[PDB]
Amino acid sequence: QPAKKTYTWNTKEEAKQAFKELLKEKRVPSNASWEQAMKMIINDPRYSALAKLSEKKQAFNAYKVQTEK
Hints:
It is found in: Nucleus speckle; Nucleus matrix. Interacts with the N-terminus of HTT. Interacts with the phosphorylated C-terminal domain of POLR2A. Interacts with AKAP8L, SF1, SRPK1, ENAH, ATBF1 and MECP2. Interacts through the WW domains with formin proline-rich regions and with WASL/N-WASP. It is a single chain. With 69 residues, the chain is mainly α. The protein is 54% helix and 0% strand. It has a single domain, classed as Orthogonal Bundle (Arc Repressor Mutant, subunit A), CATH 1.10.10.440. The chain has 3 helices and no strands. The chain is globular, with a radius of gyration of 12 Å.
């Protein structure tokens, strides 16, 4: 196809994993707002790892709690 490469997810852990790993690669800070983290991660196809934005936010919030303390 005329474009970049797309990722594919089948298990909730894999999709949630790409979203969390997506924030890690985006260096999202633990104090980033869903807007800053979501945009920095949406630019990446990993954002498609989650079909619901509510789960996308839970993974982002969990991502900050995993890179804090």
